[PDB]
Each structure stands twice: as C-alpha cells, then as structure tokens.
Design a protein around this nucleic acid. Sequence first.
DNA 1: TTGTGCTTATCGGTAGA
RNA 2: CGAGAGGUA
DNA 3: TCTACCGATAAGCACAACTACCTCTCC
Lengths: 384, 113, 56, 109, 57, 174, 97, 76
Amino acid sequence: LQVPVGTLTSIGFSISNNNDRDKMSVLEVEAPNQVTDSRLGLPNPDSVCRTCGSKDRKVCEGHFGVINFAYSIINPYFLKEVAALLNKICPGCKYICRYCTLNTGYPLMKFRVTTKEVFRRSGIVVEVNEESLMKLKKRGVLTLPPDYWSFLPQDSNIDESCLKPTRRIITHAQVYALLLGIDQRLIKKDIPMFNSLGLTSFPVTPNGYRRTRIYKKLVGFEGNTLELSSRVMECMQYSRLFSEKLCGLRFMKDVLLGKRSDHTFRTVVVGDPSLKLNEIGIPESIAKRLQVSEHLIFRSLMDGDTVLMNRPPSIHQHSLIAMTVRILPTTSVVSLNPICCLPFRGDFDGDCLHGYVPQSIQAKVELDELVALDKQLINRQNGR
Amino acid sequence: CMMDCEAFQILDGIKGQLVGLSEDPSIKIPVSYDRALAYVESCVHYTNPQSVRKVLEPLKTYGISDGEMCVIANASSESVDEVLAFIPSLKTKKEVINQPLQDALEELSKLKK
Amino acid sequence: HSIKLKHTERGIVQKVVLSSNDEGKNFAAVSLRQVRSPCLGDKFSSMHGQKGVLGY
Amino acid sequence: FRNTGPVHPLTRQPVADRKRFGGIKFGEMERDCLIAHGASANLHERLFTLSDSSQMHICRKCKTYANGPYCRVCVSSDHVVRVYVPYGAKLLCQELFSMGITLNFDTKL
Amino acid sequence: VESTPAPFTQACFSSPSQCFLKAAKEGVRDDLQGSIDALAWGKVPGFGTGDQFEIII
Amino acid sequence: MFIKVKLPWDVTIPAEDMDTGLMLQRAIVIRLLEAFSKEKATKDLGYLITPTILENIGEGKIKEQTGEIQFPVVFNGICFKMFKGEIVHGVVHKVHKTGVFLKSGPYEIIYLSHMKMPGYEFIPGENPFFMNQYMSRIQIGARVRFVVLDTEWREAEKDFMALASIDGDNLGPF
Amino acid sequence: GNADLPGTLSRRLMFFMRDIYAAYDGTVRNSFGNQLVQFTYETDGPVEDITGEALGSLSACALSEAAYSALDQPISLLETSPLLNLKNVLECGSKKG
Amino acid sequence: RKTSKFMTKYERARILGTRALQISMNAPVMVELEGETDPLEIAMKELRQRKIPFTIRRYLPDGSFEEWGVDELIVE
DNA sequence: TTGTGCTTATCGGTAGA
RNA sequence: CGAGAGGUA
DNA sequence: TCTACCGATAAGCACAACTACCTCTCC
Ligand SMILES: [Mg+2]
Ligand SMILES: [Mg+2]
Ligand SMILES: [Zn+2]
Ligand SMILES: [Zn+2]
C-alpha cells in the first residue's frame, strides 16, 4: 500500500468531457429521490465512508458523483461559438439557394444569444435583420413568406412562445440538425474542442466541499430541454470562483495567497533600553506555553532561539527582523530596544507586533543568516 | 540464463561469504535464504563449462527460440514422444528431424554420469 | 449541555439572575467580576489627545 | 498565541478566534518581503508545512486524479505517485472540476 | 507578446473565473514558471534558494 | 525463463552513517541489501536474492525530509518468470480432501484442484490419501513435474499462487 | 481617507516586479521563459555578489515605501500631491489618447 | 568555467542548514570537536576548515549546469 | 461615485468595381 | 455558519 | 450603380475601490 513520491509540474487546462466525468466519478447515483450521501460526503450523519476507511474528516477526501441524463445537450460555454458559426453559414445551403440571393425576397437572418431579455434562457435565437425588413416593407412586402422557416426541423420540445414570426428560438436538437452537412474542417476551425460539445452529465460537489437544492432539482428526469440548459448555467454560476464575501478574487486571497500558520504569537510591545538591539523580550508566561521542535518531541522556548518579528503592514523588507529570544520576568507584553522602532515604523502607543517561530532546523539556520538584524545594517532603498 | 548449474554455483559463493562477518548491524531476512536452499536441491549438474556449451550448441546450429530452449532444459525429456506432447508449439513441423533430436538426448545423458 | 468558560474567561461569581417571559422560555445570567490592576501594557489617555501605553 | 488548535471546516487552516486558540495571518506583504530577503525554507514552512499539509495522487500512464489510490480510467495500475500539495490546491481543483474544467497533472519523478 | 502562458498568475491578479475559462477554452499549458505559482503548489520560488542543488556524492 | 534482467532502484540512505569515504561502499551495499529485503515481493517480475553484479551508480540526490539521501543504482539480478508452457517440478507437503498442496520451494504455494489429474478415487482406509488407481503412488518428499498455469497475486502479500495440472504426459514421480 | 491607492499601486507593482532575478551569467533574467530584461545590472559600486538576488522585489518594496511615506504629504489635486504624481508617472499604458 | 568562483550567501546558508540537519541526525563529524555542542558551531567549523564533502550544482538559464565543490570555492 | 476596459451597435463614410 | 455597526495599529 | 469593410461615438455593462486585528448583536 506504498506509493512513490514525485514532483508536480506542467499543469494542463482542458474543458471537461463525458469520458473523464464518467471515469472519475465513483458510485455515481442519478436517483431523484436518493441523495446518496453515504459514499461521497464526509460530514454525513453516518458511521464511516463506504468507499474508504474510517477517519475524522482528515484522511478521507471528497468523492465526486455525476448524474446521468437521457440525451445530449450542447455545452453552454460553446454556445457563442455555435451562434457565430451559424451566422456565417447559410442555414439552407450548407456553404460558405433562396437564402443566398437577394432577388428571392428572403431577408438576411442573424444568429445571436439572448440573455434574460425574452424568456430568461441563454439560447440561440434567430432574428431577421430589421434593416432588410424595412426595405421589403417599402416594396409592399408586409409579412415574411410562410416557407421562410422551412429549414428548421419540427421539434417536440417546442412549446408555447408566441414571441414573433420573425424571431424564433432554436432547441438543442435543432442545432445538431443545422450542424449536419457542414464540413468537419470548417467546424473544427470554429470550435477546437469538438469532443466536449456533448454534455450528457453534470458532476455534483461532495458534502465535504459544501448548491444542493439546485442539484436535486436538475437530477429529476423531465422534458423542456430549454430549461435544462438554464438550470445547468444557474448551478454552474454558484461556484466560489465566480464573482457576486468569500467569492472570486477574495476566495483566492483567503485560500491560496494568504494563509494562517501555527507557532505564532501576537502581543503589545513596549520600550526597554536595557535589551540589546538584536534581542527581543519574551515573557516567561507566554514562552513556557510556546513549544518548539528540536532534534534529540517539543521543548519550551528559551534563550538563544530566533523568532521572525513583523509589524503590519509590511511596507518594506526591513519589517521582517530575526531577533534572539530573551526571557523577562514581565508578562503579557514584549519589549525591545527603542532604537529598533525605525525599521518597523512603529511607536509605543498600542502598536502590536506578531512574530513567527520556525520549527525546522534549516529554517532557523537560514533565518539568522539573511533576515537577522546584523545582516540588514545597510538600507537597500538608499544605501545608507 | 541459469537453469541448474550456475544458479547453484552462485549460491555456494553466498554460503562462502556468509560464514565471514556474519554479524550485521542491520536487519536480515530468512525467507530469501529458505527459498534458495529448498529449491536448488531439485536437479544438479556436474560441470559448468561442458554442460553449458553442450546446451547452447544446438541453439546455434539449429533454430530454437530462447523461451523454447529454456523450458526444454528444465524439463529434461528423455524421448521423442515426450517432447512432442509437452510443447504444443513443436507440433506439426518438419524443420528438424527427430533423429538429431535423439542424438541430442544421448549427449545430455552422456554428460550426466 | 452545560456552558464552559473559554481560555480567557475568569473571575469571581457575583450574582445569579433567573427570569422568564410569557412564552415560558427561562433565562439565566451569571456575572463574574475581577479587579484589573494596571498592567505593564495598559493604555492611558489625557484630556488633550495625549495617548500612550505604560512603559515601566 | 497558538501552538496547536482546531482547523476551519472549509479549509484546513487555523481559525481566527483568539478565545479558542488564535491564529496569525501570513499576508501577501510578508510573503513578498520574505521573497525579497530570499528565505525559501521559511516561506515553504509558512504556506505548506504549518499552514495546510495534504496529499494528492496522480496517475502516471494517464493525466488524471486518483482517489489505496485507484484509477478507473485504466486498469488497476501499479505506477501511481503521491505529490505533496496544500489543501487549497485540492480545493481549487475540486472547484474547477465542479465548474467544468479538467486539469492534467504531469510528474517528473 | 512574449508567448509565455501563465493562467494561474493572471487569475490570481484579477478575474480568476474568466481567466480560467479562457485557459480551458484555449487549452493552454502552465509550466509553473512563476514564483507565486510554485508557492501555491508547495514548491520553491527558485530565485534565492532553489536554483542550485546540493549533491553529497 | 530465468533471464538476468537489470533493474534500477532509488534506495535512500539515512544520515546516521555517512562517513568513511575510503570504504563508503560498505554502507552502499548494505543500503541496497535492506532495500529489496524490506519489499521482498513482486507482481509480475518474480524474486531476487543476491545483487551479483553492480552495473553503475548515480549521483546521490538529497531531500529535506529527516536527513535522507537517495542513491540511483542500476544492477542485474536473478529472477524467474512463470511463463505458460513450462514443465516445472515440485515437492508435495501434505494431502487433504480438496486443494492438494504442492510446494515448488517456499517462494510460492501451489494448489491442485479436482479437475486437474486423471480419474482417481479417494482412499480413506489409511492415514494419508492415495491416488494409486492409475498405478502411481504419490507421497510427501517425492518430486513431481507438471505444467504451470496462469499465476495469480494478492493485494498485500502478492503471493505467486497458481494452478497445477497433471494433464500432460510423464505424470507422477520420476 | 486616502489609503487604498498606495496599497493597490504596491500590489500591482509587486505583481510585475516579483518575477525578476539575476542569474549566474551576470544578466538580469525573468521567471517566465527566462526572458532577458537587462544585460547588466547598473551597480555603481560593483563590489557585490548579486548572482542570486531578487532585484525586482526589492525595487518594488522601495517604491512601495516611497508611496506609503507620501501619505504625510498633502494629497490634493488643486495644490499638489506627490503620491498622485507618482501614481500618474507609474501608470503610462492606461493614459492613451 | 563562466563562474564567479564565489560562494553566495544563499548557497552558504543552505549548506549550513543541510549540515546542521545531518549532524542533528547522529552523524559523525569529519573535523575534530573540542568544547562544541551545537550543530551550527560544528557546521561553521567544518565550513571554515573546508573539509566538508559537499558538491554544488549551479543551474544556468540556458538549461546546462556546472558542478563545483566546497573546497574549490572561497569564503568571505 | 468615478476609473478603465469591452463589447455592441449604429449611423455614416469612403472608394470601388 | 454567516450577516450588520463600532473600535485598534 | 450598389455595396464592403472601416471609422467615430453613444451605450450598457461590467470589476474596483489598502493591510492585520478586537469587539458587540441577529441569524
Ligand atoms: Mg505615536
Ligand atoms: Mg502608534
Ligand atoms: Zn471516501
Ligand atoms: Zn490511470
């Protein structure tokens, strides 16, 4: 049950497809009435995980599950590319024809995506160019020909819309019909990810990673394919990376950029000219509870150890100064030489200094060789 | 490429080097030594150079693959009907006459006193 | 269950007050007192915007 | 002051509650200053060792993520390596997979 | 212009969702050349300590 | 199929014993000796006992993990692949009503099922079961040759278990 | 009242200057693709060992210190504002047309 | 070749840390010890006596690398 | 409350064959 | 667990 | 003789507006 250790490099990015989604999901359940919160959720009210060993939410990761539909739906991310492609290629000639010659009285049509303006659905809607329509009206043509929309195959998913005879919404099934007959080379150039077009499944986040009501709404098998895409788009926007407090850039800052560490202390600082410039006064009450790791397993802090002191905000590199710990009979306060207040740009009126205690021996060795006070005697800003 | 002889000789070197400085600061394994003692006592040969040369000699003058020659040396058949019934890959062929094969078996029996 | 004091909770019990509303929900209040002698890092202020902490 | 304490339920990081155990935030400015100083062992400890230490298994024959570790894309493989990444990286990978992005990981060793 | 892709650093700069979507659509490959990318995945930056190797033998 | 195929390793060495540059090879050989002794198992390669010839050693890479230094060393060793179509001998250890035990050395345990030998009947009139119906007496200690079948393996132990069949000619002891 | 501008400027300058380092060849390289920025560091006093230092990070820190210290100066559009002048100088690509 | 022939502060600190880690793991010291109990002091003595058997491999931007030694380099 | 981009989009607006 | 108001550097 | 791209200008929509902490008070 042992595995080797290797480094990680060259991270790749790609859009999820059906193969990876159906191969990475373990014990995927698509039952509408079953939440299946026993093989993928760690904080579930159960004894242990059915796919891994018993743990305390520290050894079992978050298993993924993907629901299965009964048909194929185009990925919402590629809708713009499909709409752009359909605008160029005429929908009745399959070339780069009644729709190609202007003398047939057929006005030019444009494919575009509507966003919450008509039916609150991000789909493909065909709109007749009003400029061409106005020219036809001047010629006595008040209404479009009845066979204008003969290129759209009949779809059972179509419902009562009654928007206008000039504007029609394309169902997901009709898009594939329009794509049929188009050369593969032309389609590949417009859409690189040809394999990821088919979206027949959607993964569900585990309970450990915490969004559930919408997931339970989309698992129910029902018609109205124009609503499934809207539901998928709505549930995808509930991700923490999308902007709307822990969301978007704030999530990145709070998770990956800024992190909290152990073996740290924060107390108020006062003046003590008796101590040396490279020494920091740590009270015996706090230093006794602070534990360090030394090879002979945790001993208390004592004299000679180095701590990384810092005053927020760290406006320059001289705010990080490594000082030797000196035990003082005082309590609940730290003391340092008042001359050393210049690098920290801080007074003594309630200013608090938070320090960091290294644990590994190498970090201690490199701390007093580069970040020590005697190594920062020359200011890097001006050389003085 | 050790069938019986040179696999036994290298084990003798292990025994010869084991008596010297038997005390080891690290751990030891008794399963590996048991696998060598209780498997090498199946079939043994007399001399290493003469046996290997007489085994590899038909490998040069006649066409036999490495896998087929290894499995026929471990089995050590003593007739012509036995080899034709063991290996199905040697069935329905006329590349080598059975009489030279009989002579080869005689040489194998001659080197084994 | 019971409510326990945290790491920075201490004092001497002064009074216990029990009360309830018309809905029947009972309430309990316990007060803890402690004398705060001036420590070495206490902050003091003046009447003219002079603020600073104790030094020695 | 903090030596050992509870972790946040979402991300395996110390909680910002002084009453229970406390926790000091290692912000971006401190990281930039430490980079300017050049101390890499201290920075590696403040972000991965003492902040959040986790493990991740990546298949070698393919480029996927394996959950002992097993890979359902292929047959049961005997060549699966373990990488040491912070829990934040795993959370970001899970978020990307949920929003519809699949990541491919390659291992040099 | 420099032909050096870096989706992770750009996402950390601003608008991570849009940058990630663009990277996924383009199918770019991030080599983790930046220091922040290495730090976010538990790797040394490579500027002061990390650009040399200490071999005992 | 006992071809000496070379196989490199990445054995690590603790920092407790790093000295004696004139005789550091003693620490190197004992490090690789405990490397394959701790494993002592394989999936489809076989087994190894002694590192006869050391081909070449590489530069020792270090890591900041409790003072450990790896050593990329490649060498050849003795192994055995149970290829299909080989007549291998074995010694019987015991006998029972089902699953006759057969040991081709302590490296593996081979079991013989009922549908492997010819038509025979169990003899319960004595202490050990006999199969002398076809004029052949089999007991413990006698070497019997048979045709090797496909070998199986486990998850933790990964034993080289297989099936024994006496369907071939020249059955019984010789 | 006016403190977000120095922080934003420092962050955006650090995101540009944190990837700059000097190589063993004496040239100032970049982390992305080993892009060459400067063939030789100025180094008016050339008695130094900067073959592995992060020059961009310390330059960004110095500029951040200069920007933060400008808060004491009057931040005024009518009379003068050293911080706003520094921000306008550091922002050239935005000012187009 | 094409090297400044000087050991930088970062390399020196990394070597000292590695040597201190090795010493803390019960490793014999090549240099004689007299009244010394801290691993850092022993590492400093070994570095000053240039008798520590470590090799430095410096990576160049083009992809190549150069292998040096502690005794080959000079300290200041 | 502004500060930059970013994409429509919306009219002309010129050549141009 | 979040949300809203005050305060400290 | 009748367009095919090109240009100037609203327009509507987005993201963003500093760090490290401590408090109360509804949920
Ligand atoms: Mg003051
Ligand atoms: Mg102050
Ligand atoms: Zn599980
Ligand atoms: Zn795989």
